[PDB]
Amino acid sequence: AEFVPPPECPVFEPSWEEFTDPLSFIGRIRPLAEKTGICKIRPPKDWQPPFACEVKSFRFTPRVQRLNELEAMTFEQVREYTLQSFGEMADNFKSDYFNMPVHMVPTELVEKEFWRLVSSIEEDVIVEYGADISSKDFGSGFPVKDGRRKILPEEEEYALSGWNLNNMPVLEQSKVPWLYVGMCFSSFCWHIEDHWSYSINYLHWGEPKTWYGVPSHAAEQLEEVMRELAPELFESQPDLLHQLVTIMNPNVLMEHGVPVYRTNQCAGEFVVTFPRAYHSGFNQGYNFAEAVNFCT
Template structure:
């Protein structure tokens, strides 16, 4: 039997080789709702005791302590789990989760999955190391790390003083990644895994920072952070004290910033205003034409370009 260490060594040898081609197949990012989940689902498996288990990934993203349950639609990959069918050497490149949320991955069956992770507080150092290692790629695509197409060995990253940790996930085990914790990995052989995101109260500050980060790189978010805050406030569901504290703090900051921006526009001579119900429009119809942020509280428009709206 080939050891995990031997497979790992061969994986990185192939990665670093310039004259060896290897073709692998990876069934990645497959919606559990369309292709089926490894966990029991209602009503199909309503008699199964795990249908309502909080560890069932079909429930975890919308559990009581996850803010994602307040979003108005199911988001594939974040709220609806994705399933993954891997083979030896199939890999997932360095990335963070959408909105810098938490993620949880369960390996249902098959060969181990090898993970590499960088702590949240080393994210900036990791990005600097990546730019130093492949500057020519970042010149072409400054948002390279958003593409999830770049694989660099842990040793090269560690050479820049960035801590990198590893774990071999076995069948029947969960792996959880934290907000803005870069991670990558590969499969040691055939396996079947499932993953989803969740957003507990301590995620909110990171989530707001992520929206600001996305705007710099003109990356469209998956949902409106401001809309999530407002929906939680207006919801009939009672919020925990932890949620109330963070939501109130962020709403105060959000409204203060909104007030200042509107006053600034008034000083610039913007006088005409009309009400718009943003949630009645699809997300792609209310994106800022410049930074692609999904607009919710307000937008700026000009009669010279009536089809375009902009973030304040």
């Protein structure tokens, strides 16, 4: 059977008056976005933050990911890349897999093929991605007043903007942004954030990032479906460890009454996940994202 795309999550296009402050805006859209788990925010057209990462020194060792790892139970280790050398590998993989220029591959085709490969036992596809990349060690994608890099006058409005993820509040009453370097089919499984916190993700550039989200009111139903279909060796594991292998086709959740919403996060767009909103997804191609957990 072919993959059935879930319904689209809400997309918001705030004006310059509404793009004022993120927390104020997120609080106003909450009555709708909390009912879908995730939402997308498109900044005004002329809000274009410049990429501040030192690409001349950005070197990292990605990790290997096999799409049908869970179906194999029912050695692939890697080289150091630069941001450019990784992009050349990522584009070569996608163009060779689909036999067409990378920007010509439709997003619905990659989505259908991704979930086919996840459940396919007759074809093993291996991809790589950069995760667990702290902006404190590699530098943020947004301009910042750090004491280790120079910002221009044109960059100052973005270093001080409330939508700069380095300026989000991360202290709960009684933390730095992380980086993601993706390629086609690189994916993250279903999870919620620590302390059930909010999370905001900005796609600096590259090909889209496909999201799936579940509202918080269905969190227990997802976990029940997950426990009923997960392998017996992983069902008894704590959720912190179990969330490392909780890959599941969204149609499986939808067939059991779990509401799922999707979206294609494009370059220059924000995605916000609400408290206890399970989410997962995959990258359509070579891209660069930055994310942080914040609190209200």
